[PDB]
A paper describes a structure:
Energy-coupling factor (ECF)-type transporters mediate the import of micronutrients, such as folate, cobalamin and pantothenate, in the majority of prokaryotes. A tripartite ATP-hydrolysing motor (ECF module), composed of a membrane-embedded scaffold protein (EcfT) and two cytosolic nucleotide-binding proteins or ATPase subunits (often hetero-dimeric - EcfA and EcfA’), forms a functional core complex with a membrane-embedded substrate-translocating protein (S-component). Structural and biophysical analyses of ECF transporter complexes from three different organisms, with different substrate specificities, and from different laboratories revealed that the core complex and minimal functional unit exists in a 1:1:1:1 subunit stoichiometry. Based on these fragmented structural insights, a model for the transport mechanism has been proposed in which a substrate-free solitary S-component with an outward-facing binding site topples within the membrane upon substrate acquisition, associates with the ECF module, and exposes the binding site to the cytosol, thereby moving the substrate across the membrane.
Accordingly, we incubated ECF-FolT2 with Mg-ATP and folate prior to sample vitrification. The S-component for folate (FolT2) remains docked to the EcfT subunit in the substrate-free inward-facing toppled state. The ATPase dimer adopts the open conformation, albeit with bound nucleotides. The nucleotides interact only with motifs from a single ATPase subunit and are separated from the signature motif (LSGGQ) located in the other ATPase. Notably, the nucleotide occupancy in the nucleotide-binding sites of ECF-FolT2ATP is asymmetric with ATP and ADP bound to the EcfA and EcfA’ subunits, respectively, which has been also observed in other ABC transporters. ADP is bound exclusively by residues from the EcfA’ subunit, and its presence suggests that ATP hydrolysis had occurred. In contrast, ATP remained present in the EcfA subunit, where the adenine moiety of ATP is sandwiched through π-interactions between Phe13 in the EcfA subunit and Arg174 in the carboxy-terminal end of the S-component FolT2. An indication from such asymmetry comes from the structure of the nanodisc-reconstituted full complex ECF-FolT2ATP determined here in the presence of ATP, resembling turnover conditions. Intriguingly, this structure adopts an open conformation, but where ATP hydrolysis has occurred only in one of the sites, while ATP remained associated with the second site, and was apparently protected from hydrolysis. We speculate that the S-component, which remains associated with the ECF module in the nanodisc environment, hinders the conformational transition needed for hydrolysis of the second ATP molecule.
Author numbering:
A (entry chain D): 5 to 265
B (entry chain A): 1 to 13, 17 to 281
C (entry chain C): 10 to 178
D (entry chain B): 2 to 282
């Protein structure tokens, strides 16, 4: 289940990952401003345009939205019942379908859908290393606290490298324990709780040995702290990055004029 | 002229038994000195102590000198630039996110400008046989490929000594042979010194000088053709007798008489053929 | 501060938390994610504040490698950083006790799962606080009583591991 | 007995990444013999290993092992009794030690399979004595041990309940020659007790010395299944299929290239010495 990037040639794939992440963050921020049908239509048009500009099949968005469709439906219906009002179409003990209730449910569903679609667009069309580089770039202002962002970037880089390795080690450890009778999903609450130790303790031991070996390897190669080091992998801007700058900026107008002040 | 020289010293990590005790040896320049011993003999601590990761317990009588500079707290980061180590586990030492980044880690650490870094990394990656894998992730590579990346990263910063700390132990035999041949080619091309730390004596059979360790003490030293015939010492400390000498011992117990100078199996088979004349 | 070896161990624990975030235990309808276990590891081993860092980065790293389908937002990062902070406050250098486990689990599920997560879900999706809480409170009332037993056994195992030749204290 | 019918295992069925782990396999391994499973890296030895205890289930295949039958659609229920009779030790099994005590770690195996609190303890001490680990090291933490001692504990953990079939993935990879020989003789004596041992290894000397059958894989396809004196008979065949040959066999080939006759096939050192003695007789 590791790896969600899907290659493509459309102009979205060439946008700098920092600009793409900023566009995602700004879209999530701007969704907060939608409170009437005009603003929701505006965010709908802009989000759907951003989705179509990727060129991806709708199946990837459907696969991304499957894990949360129950949550979406439950939240929308409960908001419909709790914000009911106006014309009533079906009344029961507490369940009262209403025009305002349906409007609020549609609004909540739209917010869920477009947040999910923007997140899927960001995740699918960007390589994980580039997302990591963008995230490390956005941690630069923390230097005003004089925090060593070099160590933060090093920790993120090392942790992202070792998730695929430690996952396979976890699979190997589970298989080794199962081969001698371990049950990892049976036996009731206490036994299920106990069964996590055979998974975790050898994994922690492997993490210890990997930490020691990698620390020795890094120290032996001349590592003496993040101060005074150049970089090999860099992110650089282009012309295409003007597209998200306008796309956000234009949006910032269309919301402010149209939202119910 | 010796490249590495160590005067008698001992190191303790806190523990009753010191890991090393009065260790004293010299290593030539342009050699393939091989360090062999038990799995608790203190070879890895020697490797880590050569470049200054570890320090001797008494600086007033101990001495470590590499390339004519004496090792000390001030001199570390200068000896560490001249010697590089390729460790046992191929993937534990793989720090970069890709092959190119892993090779470029050492040059980043030395504040090399990026325009020169690109050329140096490309040349180092091309020196080993992984020109097309410059973007492969660590998990997409086998053990031999990751050891090639480690050797390329060590070669990028241009050291004068390469210490292979049981690098080929975790590889398949073909991977072992490929890595050893690559290291030999690199040593010949760049004129380096190679210190190979290994358990089995097959690798040490081609060495220019053999150092054998036990309980942190240098038990013997010399050419492989003069260390191996002392089979009783090898059996005493529990080491693999190499093929030719073990077979010669079995012929001894079988009653066949052969010269003691016999070596690599071609000489042995020709000796049997000339004996077959009678 | 932390030496290089301890920084690499912190990255290892962050990766372990990220991986455990994907593992579920339970029957066909009631499943609990093992992510909380990682948080305990960040609080038991590295203390209240460093675990906070390990809490935040683990949210970034996971979002990089498994995808943040729940919306790229900084509030969930703050919650994932705040959890291990409380766990470290309750468990860092103190001997393992039942009441520390009870208190740490209750406080984490009251401040992070209930509260902050509900507040940010409500703010993101426009619904008010009571709507968000009513759509969640079942899981946040069932799960802590399982997390208690799991955390007790994990702490026993980790205290077993720490007092060995492997750990370098 | 162990028997495979037409078996295939395909990693990630469908999908752009669809690697065929195993090809059409058809073989029968006789109970009570020593079998060495050989092949180059990436040949599918680990998948064939995991197929034995139904960790990996076939895709359009049938397996008959220890009386059990495994088919692609079989369920996870009832595999507890299969994994009691067919047990696997993985490569670097010492990494699985997690318990508070050496004795507790060794008896964690039998206890999972219904052994009582006394039977498990007695079996654990018996196998701790057998593997070579001495007495005072019991009641120690498994982590406060040497690598060889940790591996001995790990192997005693999977031999403690006397499984009928034991499958070992490179058991003596990093041990000393004394420990390596001790472990190999332990497995040979276990085989001589009536149980079946399946060894996955790259060392052809061990295959020549101990194995009774050799199971050769290439790219997930079974290429040969015969006695060691027949698998290593043709050097060019071994070279073609990425298979190595015993060092004793290499010396025999070189001596025959020198022209000296050697009766039989000296795959191990005593046989080579006797062959030389007969040649110069
Ligand atoms: N971190 C440590 N703290 C204390 N003692 C240690 C530590 N690491 C190793 N030792 C001990 O120091 C001695 C020397 O071990 P060393 O690592 O040098 O052995 P080796 O056989 O050369 O290793 P390798 O297999 O890595 O080549 C051994 O007795 C070992 O148990
Ligand atoms: N987790 C996996 N996912 C997909 N393909 C795999 C996986 N593991 C192995 N394979 C493929 O299946 C084949 C079987 O390899 P393996 O059984 O590991 O051989 P060996 O045990 O000799 O290394 C390999 O060639 C590999 O490409
Ligand atoms: Mg294998």
């Amino acid at each position: 289940i590791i790896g969600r990037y899907l290659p493509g040639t459309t102009f979205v794939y060439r946008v700098d990952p920092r600009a793409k992440l900023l566009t995602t963050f700004y879209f999530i921020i701007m969704i907060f401003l939608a409170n009437n049908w005009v603003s929701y239509l505006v965010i709908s048009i802009f989000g759907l345009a951003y989705v179509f500009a990727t060129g991806l099949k709708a199946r990837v968005f459907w696969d991304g939205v499957k894990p949360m469709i129950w949550m979406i439906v439950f939240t929308s219906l409960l908001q419909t019942f709790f914000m009911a009002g106006g014309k009533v179409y079906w009344h029961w003990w507490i369940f009262t379908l209403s025009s305002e209730g349906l409007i609020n449910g549609l609004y909540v569903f739209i917010r869920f859908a477009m947040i999910i679609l923007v997140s899927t667009v960001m995740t699918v069309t960007t390589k994980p290393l580039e997302i990591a580089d963008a995230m490390e770039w956005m941690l630069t202002p923390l230097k005003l606290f004089k925090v060593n962002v070099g160590m933060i970037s090093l920790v993120i880089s090392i942790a992202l490298r070792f998730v695929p390795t430690l996952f396979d080690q976890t699979v190997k450890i589970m298989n080794a324990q199962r081969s001698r009778g371990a049950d990892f999903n049976d036996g009731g609450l206490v036994k299920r709780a106990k069964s996590v130790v055979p998974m975790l303790v050898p994994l922690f031991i492997d993490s210890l040995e990997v930490a020691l070996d990698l620390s020795t390897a890094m120290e032996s190669r001349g590592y003496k702290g993040s101060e005074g080091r150049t970089r090999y992998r860099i992110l650089e801007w282009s012309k295409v990055d003007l597209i998200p700058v306008a796309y956000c900026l234009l949006l910032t107008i269309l919301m402010i004029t149209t939202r119910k002040h | 002229g010796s490249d590495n020289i160590i005067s008698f010293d001992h190191v303790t990590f806190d523990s009753p038994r010191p890991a090393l005790s009065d260790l004293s040896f010299a290593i030539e320049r342009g050699s393939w000195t091989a360090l062999i011993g038990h799995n608790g003999s203190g070879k890895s601590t020697v490797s880590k102590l050569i470049n200054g990761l570890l320090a001797p317990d008494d600086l007033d009588k101990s001495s470590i000198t590499v390339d004519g500079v004496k090792l000390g707290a001030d001199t570390v980061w200068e000896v560490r630039e001249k010697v590089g180590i390729v460790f046992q586990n191929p993937d534990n030492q793989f720090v970069g996110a890709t092959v190119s980044d892993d090779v470029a880690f050492g040059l980043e650490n030395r504040a090399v400008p990026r325009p020169e870094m690109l050329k140096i990394v490309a040349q180092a990656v091309a020196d080993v046989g992984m020109a097309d894998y410059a973007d492969s992730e660590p998990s997409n590579l086998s053990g031999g490929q990751k050891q090639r990346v480690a050797i390329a990263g060590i070669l990028a910063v241009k050291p004068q000594v390469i210490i292979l700390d049981e690098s080929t132990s975790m590889l398949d035999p073909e991977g072992k042979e490929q890595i050893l041949d690559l290291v030999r080619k690199i040593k010949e091309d760049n004129n380096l010194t190679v210190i190979s730390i290994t358990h089995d004596l097959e690798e040490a059979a081609g060495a220019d000088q053999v150092l054998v360790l036990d309980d942190g003490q240098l038990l013997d030293q010399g050419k492989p053709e003069e260390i191996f015939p002392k089979v009783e010492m090898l059996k005493r400390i529990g080491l693999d007798i190499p093929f030719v000498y073990r077979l010669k011992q079995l012929l001894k117990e079988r009653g066949i008489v052969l010269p003691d100078e016999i070596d690599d199996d071609e000489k042995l088979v020709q000796s049997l053929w000339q004996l077959n004349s009678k | 501060k932390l030496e290089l070896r301890e920084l690499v161990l912190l990255a290892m624990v962050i990766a372990i938390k990220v991986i455990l975030g994907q593992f579920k235990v339970g029957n066909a309808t009631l499943q609990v994610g093992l992510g909380f276990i990682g948080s305990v590891m960040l609080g038991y081993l590295f203390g209240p504040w460093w675990g906070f860092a390990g809490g935040a980065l683990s949210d970034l790293v996971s979002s990089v490698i498994f995808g943040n389908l729940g919306g790229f937002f900084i509030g969930f990062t703050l919650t994932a950083a705040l959890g291990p902070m409380i766990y470290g406050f309750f468990l860092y250098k103190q001997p393992i006790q039942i009441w520390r486990v009870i208190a740490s689990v209750i406080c984490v599920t009251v401040i992070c799962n209930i509260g902050l997560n509900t507040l940010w879900v409500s703010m993101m999706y426009g619904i008010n606080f009571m709507v968000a809480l009513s759509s969640r409170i079942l899981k946040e009332m069932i799960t802590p009583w399982i997390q208690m037993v799991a955390v007790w056994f994990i702490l026993e195992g980790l205290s077993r591991v720490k007092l060995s030749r492997k750990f370098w204290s | 007995a162990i028997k495979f019918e037409n078996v295939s295992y395909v990693y990630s069925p469908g999908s752009p990444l669809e690697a065929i782990g195993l090809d059409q396999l058809n073989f029968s391994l006789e109970e009570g013999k020593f079998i060495a499973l050989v092949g180059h890296t990436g040949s599918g030895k680990s998948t064939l290993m995991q197929h034995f205890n139904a960790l990996l289930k076939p895709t359009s295949g049938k397996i008959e092992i220890a009386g059990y039958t495994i088919t692609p659609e079989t369920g996870n229920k009832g595999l507890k009794d299969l994994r009691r009779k067919v047990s696997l030790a993985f490569q670097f099994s010492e990494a699985q030690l997690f318990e508070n005590t050496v004795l507790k770690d060794v008896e964690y195996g039998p206890r999972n399979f219904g052994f009582s609190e006394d039977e498990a303890r007695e079996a654990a001490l018996k196998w701790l004595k057998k593997v070579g680990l001495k007495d005072d090291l019991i009641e120690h933490s498994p982590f406060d041990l040497s690598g060889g001692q940790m591996r001995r504990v790990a192997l005693a953990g999977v031999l403690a309940y006397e499984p009928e079939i034991i499958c070992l993935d490179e058991p003596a990879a990093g041990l000393d020659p004394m420990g390596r020989l001790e472990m190999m003789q332990l497995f040979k004596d276990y085989q001589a007790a009536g149980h079946t041992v399946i060894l996955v290894t790259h060392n052809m000397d061990d295959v020549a010395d101990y194995a009774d059958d050799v199971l050769a894989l290439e790219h997930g396809r079974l290429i040969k299944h015969a006695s060691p004196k027949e698998v290593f008979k043709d050097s060019e065949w071994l070279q073609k299929h990425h298979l190595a040959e015993p060092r004793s066999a290499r010396f025999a080939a070189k001596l025959e290239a020198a022209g000296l006759k050697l009766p039989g096939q000296p795959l191990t050192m005593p046989e080579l010495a006797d062959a030389i003695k007969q040649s110069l007789k």
